[PDB]
C-alpha cells in the first residue's frame, strides 16, 4: 500500500463521487446562449446602455491595497456632491450603494 | 365453481373471447407480420390466475 520513494497523496475519492461528476460539455453552448441573451437584452433597451455606471474602490486587505477596482454603487455622499438623488440616480444608469 | 361472482364471470367471458385463432383476412394485408395468435391459452396448460 505504501511503496517506493514517492510523494504521499491525498486523493479524496472514497465517497460515491461518480454520482456527482459535472462535466462541462456545454461550455460552448452556454457561451453562445449567453451571447444571445446579451444581444437580446441590449436590443430591448437601445440606445440606453446595458451597464450601470459603477464606482471605483480600493480592494480590501494588505495584499490588495495597491489595486483599485469597480465597486458596487456610488455612496449617498458622492451622489449628494453631484446633486443626484439615489432614487433618481437609479433611473439614469447610475448604481447606488447605501452601505459604503 | 358454479357459484361465482359477477366480477369473476366477467373476467372469464373476456378470457374466452381472447382465445380465438387469427382471422385469416389479416394475413393478406400489406406489410403484415402477424402469422398467428401468439397469446393462445389452454385451460389445462396455463391458468388464468383470477
Amino acid at each position: 500500500a505504501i511503496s517506493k520513494n514517492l510523494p504521499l497523496l491525498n486523493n479524496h475519492f472514497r465517497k460515491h463521487w461518480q454520482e456527482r461528476v459535472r462535466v462541462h460539455f456545454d461550455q460552448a453552448g452556454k457561451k453562445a446562449s449567453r451571447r444571445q441573451s446579451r444581444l437580446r437584452k441590449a436590443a430591448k433597451i437601445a440606445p440606453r446602455p446595458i451597464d450601470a455606471l459603477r464606482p471605483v474602490v480600493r480592494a480590501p486587505t494588505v495584499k490588495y491595497n495597491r489595486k483599485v477596482r469597480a465597486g458596487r454603487g456610488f455612496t449617498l455622499a458622492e451622489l449628494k456632491a453631484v446633486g443626484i438623488a439615489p432614487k433618481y440616480a437609479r433611473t439614469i444608469g447610475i448604481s447606488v450603494d447605501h452601505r459604503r | 365453481p358454479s357459484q361465482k361472482s359477477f366480477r369473476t364471470k366477467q373476467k372469464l367471458a373476456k378470457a374466452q373471447k381472447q382465445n380465438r385463432p387469427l382471422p385469416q383476412w389479416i394475413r393478406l394485408r400489406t406489410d403484415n407480420k402477424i402469422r398467428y395468435n401468439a397469446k393462445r391459452r389452454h385451460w389445462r396448460r396455463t391458468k388464468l390466475g383470477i
Binding site: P47, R48, P49, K87, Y88, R90, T91, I92, G93 | -
Partner: protein
C-alpha cells in the same frame, strides 16, 4: 356519408329528436337483417348519423345555457374555462396588477428614464 351537419343545425329541438328516433329504428332494423346478410356495411353510416344528431342536439342546448349565463358572476363549471387546475388558481390580471398607493407614488415619481451617452 349520411346526414349533413349544416342541415341539422337549421332544425328545431322537435325535428332533431324526431330524426333521432327514425335513425334508431333504422339501426334496429339493420341489426335484424344483419342476422342473415350477414355483412351489412350500411350499419356504419347510420351509427355515425346517430352520433351527428346527438352532437347537434347537445351543442344547440349548450349555447342556450351559455346565452342564459352570459355576463353572470356564477356559471356552471363545464361552461367555465378549462385551462388547467394551476392556471385557474393563479391571480387574475386585476389581482396581479394590484399596487399599494405608496408603491404607485414611487413608480410615477421615478419612471425608468430613456437616455444615451456620449453627447
Amino acid at each position: 356519408a349520411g346526414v349533413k351537419t349544416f342541415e341539422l343545425r337549421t332544425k328545431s329541438k322537435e325535428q332533431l329528436e324526431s330524426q333521432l328516433v327514425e335513425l334508431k329504428q333504422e339501426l334496429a332494423t339493420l341489426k335484424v337483417q344483419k342476422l342473415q346478410r350477414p355483412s351489412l356495411p350500411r350499419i356504419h353510416t347510420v351509427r355515425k348519423n346517430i352520433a351527428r344528431v346527438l352532437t347537434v342536439i347537445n351543442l344547440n342546448q349548450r349555447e342556450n345555457v351559455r346565452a342564459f349565463y352570459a355576463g353572470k358572476k356564477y356559471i356552471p363549471k363545464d361552461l367555465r374555462a378549462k385551462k388547467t387546475r394551476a392556471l385557474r388558481r393563479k391571480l387574475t390580471k386585476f389581482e396581479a396588477s394590484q399596487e399599494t398607493e405608496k408603491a404607485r407614488k414611487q413608480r410615477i415619481a421615478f419612471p425608468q428614464r430613456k437616455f444615451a451617452i456620449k453627447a
